[PDB]
């Protein structure tokens, strides 16, 4: 007979990153509800990242400063739009996808999930409802959400959603909108026979509000004590 309370001889369980946990939590809402996860390359060209999103070229929606680039027509992703573009150009509606993945900007690496839904008919009313219960069931609260009008060249009408986090403050969590007709028409989808909406949320924004983190630099310093807190 031996002392039964001595620690066992084995291996300590590993750790899943909190950014990937939040990413899996947001995607599973759409995964088991009809949407399919889609991924693509992180080094993109100019057409699939700008010209195909109803951006003429030298439009003010370029901002060549805060976008990492190599040549003049090859850059790092500012958003996972290329996967949504290629899905529309090859496949035909109905389209129900969510596009996670890391993107880059000069400030530098962060993840964001961008869903896309194109069917025979949708509306601004359905976009607001799907986003509301997405925010309600993610944070597991009865949130007070605010829809503000904003601008995106690929959406009209376009909106930005906030939640009353912290102490009565309004914090932006995701942008959305109804897919612009030129974005559907440029990919081979008749904007008169098919409607569509889209959205985009920063994963690091959701992860910090969900786990109470205040310095997102810890997400990529990868301190083993920090990662262990999510195990």
């Amino acid at each position: 007979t031996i002392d039964i309370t001595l620690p066992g001889r084995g291996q300590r369980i590993g750790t899943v990153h909190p950014v990937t946990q939040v990413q899996e939590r947001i995607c599973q809402f759409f995964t088991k509800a009809g949407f399919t996860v889609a991924t693509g390359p992180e080094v993109e060209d100019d057409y699939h990242n700008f010209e195909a999103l109803n951006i003429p070229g030298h439009h003010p929606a370029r901002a060549m400063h805060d976008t990492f680039y190599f040549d003049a027509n090859h850059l790092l992703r500012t958003h996972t739009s290329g996967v949504q573009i290629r899905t529309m150009e090859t496949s035909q509606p109905p389209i129900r996808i969510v596009c996670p993945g890391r993107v880059y900007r000069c400030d530098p690496m962060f993840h964001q999930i961008e869903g896309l839904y194109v069917a025979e008919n949708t509306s601004f009313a359905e976009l607001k409802g799907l986003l509301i219960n997405l925010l309600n069931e993610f944070f597991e609260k009865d949130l007070k959400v605010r829809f503000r009008p904003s601008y995106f060249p690929f959406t009209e009408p376009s909106a930005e959603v906030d939640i009353m986090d912290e102490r009565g403050r309004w914090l932006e969590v995701l942008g959305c909108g109804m897919v612009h007709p030129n974005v559907l028409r440029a990919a081979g989808i008749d904007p008169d026979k098919y409607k569509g909406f889209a959205f985009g949320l920063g994963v690091e924004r959701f992860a910090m509000l969900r786990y109470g983190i205040n310095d997102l630099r810890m997400f990529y310093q990868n301190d083993v004590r920090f990662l262990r807190q999510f195990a």
Binding site: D3, I4, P18, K32
Partner: protein
């Protein structure tokens, strides 16, 4: 139910091959299990007439004969058939014949006598004869036609399996109506002729029950019970799976297969006074027509008289009223019995007759009057007798009601999903037997026929439309729903549990939920397992109180087949039934079982294979628990089937969620299991939800300190660790044991433990004063609580 196709052709001849006919029945809801010819195929066998017979050749007991099969110069053939009259006409296989089994008789010579075929085949033709040598009974002579056409041996028997909702199809008339509806034909039923009454004999009406709303009885005097059963009626019953008996039983079995109305004939001389259709007396005795004597109940309807009982109503007749070879006058019964008054009662006594299953299901209540005329016509034609009047005992108000059902085009379009023509809906229903009246403009008022018991709501009529129109005409669509994101909390999913246990080297087993009660008693001698009432075997009779009672036989299965190492895990329902006063107190807990025998890792060149110890098994259970963020304290388990010194109880918040440890070594020898490691965990405890909370990390270096205690071996290291963490305060953030020693230098009964103390500061850098103050505080309380000696 097996029926002859040619008998079905006499009612409906669709002029299509047998394959498409069976395809129509299967696609109509009547799954044909088999369609085969009456006899196995064979080529070349005509009919001949035997002329002369000579005996005593080649000693023994043979006879050479000559048969005229229409040939100009017929040849001979020897045979040893013991018959009566010589010179019979019998089908004969030719020389180039191909009897079943490659029995091509190559003529030759039977010791000199030249042969040309075989003029026999009592069993070689697939006929079921009693006495040998009865090849083709001399009933008549088809004058040399092929044997496949005289007895209709190329006919097909259709083995139809019909569902209980279609009780009308348990007869030739019910199947022919189905074949006539699908092919838009009209069934030409055989013209039935009623028998006129010449005598005026007795009668009896009895309304002592509600399960016989229509009874018809006919007294027929001076019948020939020993009459000859014709070949057409014998074969029609034979290839329908019904045996031959007397002439009266064959007729009642014939009308049962033809129309679907069961009948029964009694021995009028053995009926005393009036006949009664009543409920049996409590525990009333009766000897059926078979040697079985049954004891009835007061809910089984029977047909009795003024003293005794004659038969069970619509199930089986009795021996006291059976028509024997001394029977002269008979009483023919033709009644409709309510299906609710016959269902189940036949299975009580192990009985399932053709009259039983048809009365339990729906039988045409407008048919008793028709089957009475059918039997009386066949009885007079085939046996003859003095026929009396028809006794009608009818309670017309309690017949199965068939009120009108309303059906609209919108209901048929909604349920089917596609539009069927209103001309199709009316035509299909009206030929199935319904009287549909076009109410209003687009709706219908359809009444169900008297023979169908499955039409009550409008959906029943919609099923009939899809049946006749064809299930291959169902248009393809997809259901629609709203995209709603369901509530979900972060948890340890069952799939991620399997991936962890499989990564730890365990194979998922799935054993039976019931196991042997003796093995269940071996594990826990104080167990009260839930026992099945009708288990298929003794080793599968007790619902497993633990998954070991079913996994151990699977381990022994592999161990007995040259398997040194077998590791299982199952998910995993056990049945807690102890300390329960009723079966509603049963607890069905989904659990995670672990069974491991043999070495930890497979045999390799790194080390010699040795079985695990307790800490190898605990290290695997600790990781399964850690994979679900489960905080656990361990304590000694007291389960009977466990080694009391190496078995833990897994507690969370003080309550147990499972155990881990090796089997009791005595049980290992009784089961021949070497050394086994078992564990069980509640899934609700392992597959639990979790929530992560972020805490700040210090930006300044920590301090590492060592303490070496010499303490008695009878104090658990958890209590030592818990005491150090409490007295250490908030500065001490973590501690862990890293060395034990029980060798030379320590007295017996004590051990030297070495703990590691990690001191952390949230804001500043630790000074040597506050650390030594905590170190001295921890060593002092350890010397006071346990009387130990410390070092650094």
């Amino acid at each position: 139910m097996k029926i002859s196709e040619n008998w079905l052709r006499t009612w409906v001849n669709p002029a299509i091959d047998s394959d498409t006919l069976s395809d129509q029945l299967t696609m109509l809801g009547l799954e044909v299990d088999e369609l085969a010819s009456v006899a196995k195929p064979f080529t070349g066998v005509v009919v001949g007439e035997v002329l002369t017979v000579e005996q005593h050749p080649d000693a023994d007991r043979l006879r050479v004969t000559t048969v005229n099969i229409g040939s100009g110069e017929p040849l001979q053939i020897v045979c040893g058939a013991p018959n009566v009259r010589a010179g019979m006409k019998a089908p004969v296989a030719t020389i180039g014949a191909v009897l079943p089994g490659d029995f091509k008789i190559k003529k030759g010579k039977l010791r000199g006598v030249e042969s040309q075929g075989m003029l026999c085949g009592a069993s070689e033709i697939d006929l079921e004869d009693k006495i040998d040598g009865l090849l083709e009974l001399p009933a008549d002579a088809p004058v040399g036609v092929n044997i496949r056409e005289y007895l209709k041996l190329d006919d097909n028997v259709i083995d139809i399996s019909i569902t209980p909702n279609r009780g009308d199809c348990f007869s030739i008339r019910g199947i022919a109506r189905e074949v006539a509806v699908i092919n838009q034909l009209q069934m030409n039923e055989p013209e039935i002729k009623s028998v006129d009454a010449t005598i005026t004999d007795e009668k009896k009406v009895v309304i002592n029950t509600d399960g016989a709303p229509r009874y018809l009885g006919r007294v027929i005097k001076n019948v020939n019970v020993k009459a000859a059963t014709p070949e057409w009626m014998e074969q029609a019953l034979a290839r329908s799976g019904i045996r031959t008996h007397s002439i009266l039983v064959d007729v009642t079995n014939y009308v049962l297969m033809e129309l679907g109305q069961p009948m029964h004939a009694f021995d009028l001389a053995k009926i005393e006074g009036t006949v009664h259709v009543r409920q049996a007396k409590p525990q009333e005795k009766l000897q059926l027509l078979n040697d079985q004597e049954v004891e009835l109940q007061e809910d089984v309807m029977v047909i009795a008289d003024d003293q005794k009982a004659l038969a069970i109503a619509g199930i089986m007749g009795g021996l006291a009223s059976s028509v024997t070879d001394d029977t002269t006058d008979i009483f023919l019964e033709s009644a409709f019995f309510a299906p609710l008054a016959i269902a189940g009662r036949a299975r009580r006594f192990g009985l399932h007759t053709d009259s039983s299953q048809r009365y339990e299901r729906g039988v045409d209540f407008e048919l008793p009057v028709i089957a009475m005329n059918r039997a009386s016509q066949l009885i007079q034609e085939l046996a003859g007798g003095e026929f009396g009047p028809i006794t009608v005992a009818e309670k017309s108000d309690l017949l199965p009601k068939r009120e009108a059902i309303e059906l609209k085009q919108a209901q048929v379009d909604q349920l089917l999903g596609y539009k069927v023509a209103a001309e199709f809906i009316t035509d299909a229903l009206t030929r199935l037997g319904c009287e549909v009246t076009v109410q209003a403009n687009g709706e219908w008022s359809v009444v169900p026929p008297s023979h169908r018991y499955d039409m009550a709501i409008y959906q029943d009529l919609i099923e009939e439309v899809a049946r006749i129109d064809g299930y291959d005409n169902i248009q393809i669509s997809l259901p629609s729903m709203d995209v709603q994101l369901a509530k979900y909390q972060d948890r340890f999913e069952i799939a991620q549990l399997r991936q962890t246990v499989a990564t730890l080297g365990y194979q998922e087993a799935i054993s039976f939920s019931f196991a042997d009660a003796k093995l269940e008693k071996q594990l826990n001698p104080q167990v009260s397992p839930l026992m099945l009432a009708n288990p298929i075997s003794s080793d599968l009779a007790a619902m497993r109180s633990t998954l070991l009672s079913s996994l151990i036989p699977c381990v022994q299965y592999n161990l007995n087949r040259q398997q040194s190492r077998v590791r299982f895990f199952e998910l995993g329902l056990r049945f807690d039934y102890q300390n329960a006063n009723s079966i509603q107190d049963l607890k069905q807990i989904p659990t995670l079982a672990l069974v491991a025998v043999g070495s930890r890792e497979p045999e390799s060149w790194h080390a010699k294979p040795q079985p695990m110890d307790f800490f190898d098994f605990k290290g695997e259970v600790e990781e399964i628990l850690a994979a679900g963020r489960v905080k656990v304290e361990y304590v000694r388990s007291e389960r009977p089937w466990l080694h009391p010194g190496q078995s833990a109880e897994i507690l969370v918040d003080g309550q147990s969620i499972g155990y881990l440890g090796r089997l009791h070594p005595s049980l290992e020898n009784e089961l021949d299991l070497s050394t086994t490691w078992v564990a069980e965990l509640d899934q609700a405890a392992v597959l639990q939800s979790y929530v992560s909370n972020f805490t700040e990390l210090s930006r300044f270096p920590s301090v590492r300190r060592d303490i070496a205690l010499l303490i008695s071996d009878n104090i658990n290291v958890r209590d030592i660790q818990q005491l150090i963490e409490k007295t250490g305060g908030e500065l001490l953030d973590s501690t862990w044991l890293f060395d034990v020693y029980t060798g030379q230098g320590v007295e017996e009964g004590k051990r030297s433990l070495a703990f590691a103390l990690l001191w952390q500061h949230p804001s500043r850098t630790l000074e040597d004063a506050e650390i030594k103050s905590g170190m001295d505080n921890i060593i002092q309380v350890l010397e006071n609580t346990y009387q130990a000696t410390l070092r650094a």
